[PDB]
C-alpha cells in the first residue's frame, strides 16, 4: 500500500473508535443503558494496528495518527523505496481506556456513576504498561499514558513541542529567553512566527499586548513550565524549567521520550572543584560519575556512558564564536552528580571518590539527563558555568548577591542557542528511528 | 553564676566581636589596610564559649544568644536547681567567617577585592562543619551555616518560626490556611495577633488591606515558602510548602532541626492499595517501609522507626471530634515511600515487596520526615487522605478534575489544627533537650 | 643551586655508595670480615636525596641519576626559571639492598655464605615497597625493584627504551617490524641509526650479517621480548610482544610506568559483533566495558575511563592517509574486554550485558592497558582489526588459514607507525610530569 492510504485509514479508524466510545459514555450517563457484549466484541473500541513485512513482519498499535503524521509518513516511505515490504492496516484486540477520551463531557458524577463507569467500561490495568517483532519502541497504551501527563506537568498542548530541547534550572534564563523571542518575532525576516507560553498564551506579531508572556501564575499551578518558539516548518526551540533535583529530571525525560526529539541540551550552573577556576568559567563534560541512586536498577553504574563528538564540536565552536576570543575560560572534564543537596556535611567521605575520578565540577542533574538520552537514543550535551567555589571558601547561593555570575547569563543562553543553530544547519533495533 | 549574668555576658561578647569584624572589613575596603596578627590573636574575632560542670564538664560555642534566649535560659536554670553545677563564660579559639556578618555593607567589589577578602580574612572550611564532652547537639559553625539557608529557601527571618510545624504539598491547603488565619486575627478574643507571609509581608489587625497575603510572586523566588501565625507567648503555627520529592523533605529538616521544634506533622494525599478504600478516606501510619535511597548511608534500613503513642492518640481524637461521627473512614497501616514518580512502569517488581509488608497506601515524603524526626529527637506524625486508586483503574492526578477529594480539603486542615491544639493543651545524651 | 651541580653531586654520591657496598660484599666473602656499625651509620650505604622548596618543600630519593638525566634536568630547570625554589642535595636514611648492586662478582656461594649475606647486610623488606610532600610518583626502592624485572621479562637493558611504545600479540607484526627497521637503517637519510633486539643483538649499518635479528631462541627464554629502533636524539620506536591475557598486560605496564613514556598504542585483532562487519575492517574504541577482574580492587568499575582527543584524531588521520581512500571500513564504538578465552560456552549470560552497552567488538587486552595508562597518566590509544565473526558462524583462529586478515598485516602496522609519527610531529599532583 502507498503510505497515504495507510495514514488515511489509520485516522478514520481512530476517529470512529473514539466517537463510538464517547457516545456510549454519554448515553450510559444520560439514560442508564449498557452496551452489547457482542457488537463491542466486533472491534468497536479498539486501537488500529499497522504491520510491515520485509526478515519478518513487525506490528504495532497506533495511538494518535494525526499528531505523529510526518514521522510515520517518512519512516514508512523510507522502507518503501529501499526495501521490499508490504503494509497492512487492521483492528487490534486492545481497548481504549475511557479516561483518555474525555473531551466533550463534564463528569459531575456521584459515587454510583463512577462505580458504574469503572465496572462496565474499559479501564487502565498496570500489568499492560511497561507478527512477532516490535516495530517501534512504545505501544499505544504507553504513549497515551505519557501524553496525558505531558499536558499536566508542563501546561501546553503536546502538539506544540519542538525537536530541539533546552533544559534550565534558573528563572533568569526563562526571562531572557522570553524577551529574546518576543524581540525576534517582530522581525519581518525571521523563521519564527509565534510564541506559546505555559498556561495557554499564544503571542503573534499582531497582538496588541506583548506584556503578558511572563506571568507569575505559571509557577503556581504547573511544576515544570515550558515555552515554545514555533516555526512554520516545525523546527523551533523549546525551553523547559525542570527545577532542582535528579528525580525531576528523570520523569520529564520518561514522558518526553515518546515524541522523539532531535537533541537535549542542559544549561545550568555548578560549583568548581579546582583552584585555578574563577567564577564565570565554562565547564564541558566528557564523562559522568553517577552518584544519584535513581536508574541504578535499570542501567547499572558499570555501563559506560560515552560522549557524542558532533555535539561537543558544536558547543566548542559556539563558545569560540559567541565569546569573541578560550583555552583559559573553558575546561573539559568529569562532572559529579549527587542527590544530596548538603554533601558538605559528609564531605570527608566523598572526598575519596572525588580524587579517583579527577573531577572538575559538581551539579545535580546532568548525569540523569545523559543516562536518559542514552537509554532512548537521543543525542545529549552539557555546558555548565561556575557559580561558586565550595572547597576554597567562596561558597554562594543561586539567587543571592553575585555580580560576576549574573553578568554571564545573557551570554550563556546565546551560546546554547548558537549550538542549537549549528546542530540544525548540518543534517535488536526497531526499524523506526 | 546566675543564668542572667551568663546571658548578658554572652550577648555582650558576641556583639563586640561582630562589630569588630564589620569595622575591619569596612576599613580594609575603604582604605586598603590590614589588621594586626597579634591583637587579632587576642580573641578579637572569636565565638563566646559556655561551660557547665557537674559527671564532668561540658563546653560549647554559642552563636546567637539573643535568638535562643528562652531555650538557653530554661535549660540553664533547670540544671541550677536540681543538680550541682558551675557555669563559666569565656572566649573560644574559633573564628567567625565573614559571609555571616554582612548586614551593613554593599560588596560591589571587583575580583581584586574579593581575592583580598578571601586571603586576609576568615572563611568557611568544609573540614569544620559535620571540657571533653559536648553540651548540645550542634556547635556554632553549623547553626550559623543553617540559619543562612533557612532565610533563603523559606523567605522569612529565622526569628519568626514557631514550635509546631505543619508540612503540606498542595497549594489549596496554603490558600485555606491563609484565609483561616486572616479570619482568626480579626477576632478580639484570640491568641493570634499577627501573620507573617513569605516575601516579607506583616499583617496585623490594623492594616487597611488584608488582600495581599497570598501573592503569586512567592512561588517565583523561594522554593519552599512558609507562613507563620504569630502568638504573643511564642506558641503559634507554622506552615511550610515543601513540594514533591524525598530529597526536598530532607534538606529542610536538616536546616530546621537546629531551632528545636516541638512537633512535625505531615498532611498530604496518597494512593490507596486496598479494594475496600474509597476516594476521601483517611490513612494513619504505624510503620514505614523505606524505599527512598536517601538516608541509607547514615541510618540503615535495619534500624526500626517506631511510632509515638501521644501523637497517634491526638490524631485519632481530632479525627473523631472534627469529622462528627470512624471505624470505616479511617484506617491504620503501613505506608510505602518511594523516590520514583513513575513506579507503575516497574510495578511487576515492587509488587513482591508490597505483599510482604501488607501495605495500605503509597506516598513520597512521610518516611523521610519520620526518619529525620527520629534522628534529631523530634515527635512526628502523619495523616494522609486517599486521592486515587492506581491498582483498580481509578488513577487521577493532583490538581485535575476531582470533586470528591477537593471537598475534603477544608476539613483535613481542621483535623491537623485540632491535633496541634490537643498536643499543645497537654504538657551519650547531651544534657540540653 | 644550578641544576648541573645537583646532577653531578647526585651521580658522585650514588657511585660512591655503590662502590662501597660492592667492596664490603667482596671482602666479607673473601676474608670473613664484618663492617663497623658506626661508620656504616655515617650514611655509608644510603641513597642520595633531592629536595626543592617553593607551597612547601618536596623531597625524594634518587636511584639512578645517570639514566634519568634528561628528564630530571628539564624538570629541575623548568622550576628554576618560572618559580622561586631552592635545591638541596644530601644523604637519606634508606639503604641500598645488595641484590641490586651485583655487577662485579659471582656468587657461587654455599648455604653458609648466603645466610651470612642475609644476616649482616641490607635486604629487601616488603613493608617498604608500595619535607612532607612527595616530589615524584615513585621513590628509589620501587624504581630499583622495577628496573630489575624489566631486564628479565624483556631481555634488553633499560637504557635503550624509547618513549613511543607499541603493543602487539601476533608475531607476524614482529617479523614485519624487524624487516622494515632493517630496511630503514640502511637509508643514508633517516633518523634511525641502530636496532636493538631481544637477547643482546646490536645491528648497525656496518654489520656484515643483517640476517640474525629475528632468531627463534628469543621466545624460549624471555616471556615478553622487545625490539627497539634507536634514534640519535632519543625519539625512536619500541615494540613489545606482550602475549595473550589481561594479566600479562598489567604487570608489564606496572614495570614500564617508571620510565615515563610518551604514548602507549595497542595494535591487535578482535572479533566483530555486528552483522555489517566484514573480516578486515577497523574498529576504534571510544569507551571500554571492563569485565576483567584485575584492577577492580584499586580502580572500581564505577570510575569512568575517557578517551583522548589528540590520539583519536591522529589515528583517524593516519588511517585516512595510509588506506588511500573510510566511512565504511572504519567504525567507532565500545569494546568489551574479558579474561575468559572460552566465553562462547557461557554466552547466554554475557549476552545481556552485550546488549546494554551496544558493543562493537571483543578482545582481551585493551581495557587493562587503558586503565593502566589512566592510573599513571600516560596517553593511550587502540586500533583493532576484525579477524572473525563468532556470532554469525564464521569463527576462526589466530594463526590458521585466513587469507583476508593476513593480507592486512603489513598495512595495519603502517597505520600505527604513521600515527606515532603524527603524534611526535606536534608538541595532589606531584610537580614532576
Numbering used by the authors:
A (entry chain A), B (entry chain B), C (entry chain F): 8 to 61, 80 to 155, 167 to 361, 366 to 467, 479 to 484
Paper passage:
The cryo-EM map of K. pneumoniae Amn was determined from images collected on a Titan Krios equipped with a Falcon III detector to an estimated resolution of 3.03 Å. Ab initio models confirmed the D3 symmetry expected from the homologous crystal structures, and all further refinement and model building enforced this symmetry in the interest of improving resolution and mitigating the moderate orientation bias of the sample. The map lacks density for the first seven residues of the protein, as well as presumptive loops at residues 61–79, 156–166, 362–365, and 468–478, but otherwise possesses the features expected at the estimated resolution, including clear density for side chains. In keeping with the prior E. coli structures, no significant ligand density is evident at the active sites. The active site is composed of residues from two chains; a cleft of conserved residues in one chain binds the nucleobase and sugar of the adenosine analog, with H188 and Y189 of the apposed chain contributing to stabilize the charged phosphate group. In the apo structure as determined, the core residues expected to stabilize the nucleobase and sugar (N205, W383, M404, E405, and D428) are well positioned to do so, whereas R381 and K436 are in alternative conformations in the absence of the interacting phosphate. The surrounding residues are well resolved; weak density outward from the active site is interpreted as residues 435–443, possibly stabilizing the apo protein while remaining flexible enough to permit AMP access. The cryo-EM structure of K. pneumoniae Amn primarily differs from the apo homologs in its loop regions away from the active site, either by lacking density for the loop entirely or being in a clearly different conformation. As these loops are those that form presumptively physiologically irrelevant crystal contacts in the crystal structure, the cryo-EM model of K. pneumoniae Amn, lacking such interactions, is likely to better reflect the protein’s conformation in solution. Notably, the loop covering the active site is strongly conserved, suggesting an important role in protein activity, ligand gating or structural stabilization, despite its weak density.
